[PDB]
Design a protein around this ligand. Structure first.
Ligand SMILES: [Ca+2]
Ligand SMILES: [Ca+2]
Ligand SMILES: [Ca+2]
Length: 190
């Protein structure tokens, strides 16, 4: 009676914990955490930039933050929802290689209209480079493959397609690794 409208239902918590890579306490603290600030549970694009800023506070242009929100919103409604943030955040921790790879392509292309161009690849690389600049937690001295893709992909797009398409990206990513090596840090080889 009234209290039922507090905290998320336990049935979904159990099924959500089945897949989360995080513990139930971390999910409830996050849910109750921003829920108090926004009882609706729906965060605007700026809200997503704020939490992203916490993960990457050494950033500045924030262009990378809004860019993610632009292609990180499943409903593209201009706002991140509680189910999308908690579920998407869990995928960000370490979802299936296929799920994490999908998030990589969405971010790799700002308008991800199915075709990727080098200007978009360089623009996104600079976006994550500035966010990963300073020392928030950049990989090794500079694993971020910027010039590496310029030559590596330039070699793969010689076919003369005129553009870069997921057909070569996804097939090359599963055929010739390094093409999608995310600059993210890997917990281990297992
Ligand atoms: Ca949404
Ligand atoms: Ca595009
Ligand atoms: Ca091509």
């Amino acid at each position: 009676m009234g209290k039922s409208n507090s905290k998320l239902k336990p049935e979904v918590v159990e099924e959500l914990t089945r897949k989360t890579y995080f513990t139930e306490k971390e999910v409830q603290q996050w849910y109750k955490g921003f829920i108090k600030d926004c009882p609706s549970g729906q965060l605007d694009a700026a809200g997503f930039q704020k939490i992203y800023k916490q993960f990457f506070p050494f950033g500045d242009p924030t262009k990378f933050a809004t860019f993610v929100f632009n292609v990180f919103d499943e409903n593209k409604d201009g706002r991140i929802e509680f189910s999308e943030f908690i579920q998407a955040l869990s995928v960000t921790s370490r979802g299936t290689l296929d799920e994490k790879l999908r998030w990589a392509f969405k971010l790799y292309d700002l308008d991800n209209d199915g075709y990727i161009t080098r200007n978009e690849m360089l623009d996104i690389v600079d976006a994550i480079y500035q966010m990963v600049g300073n020392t928030v937690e950049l990989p090794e001295e500079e694993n971020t493959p910027e010039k590496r893709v310029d030559r590596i992909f330039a070699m793969m797009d010689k076919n003369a397609d005129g553009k870069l398409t997921l057909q070569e990206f996804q097939e090359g990513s599963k055929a010739d690794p390094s093409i999608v090596q995310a600059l993210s840090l890997y917990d281990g080889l297992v």
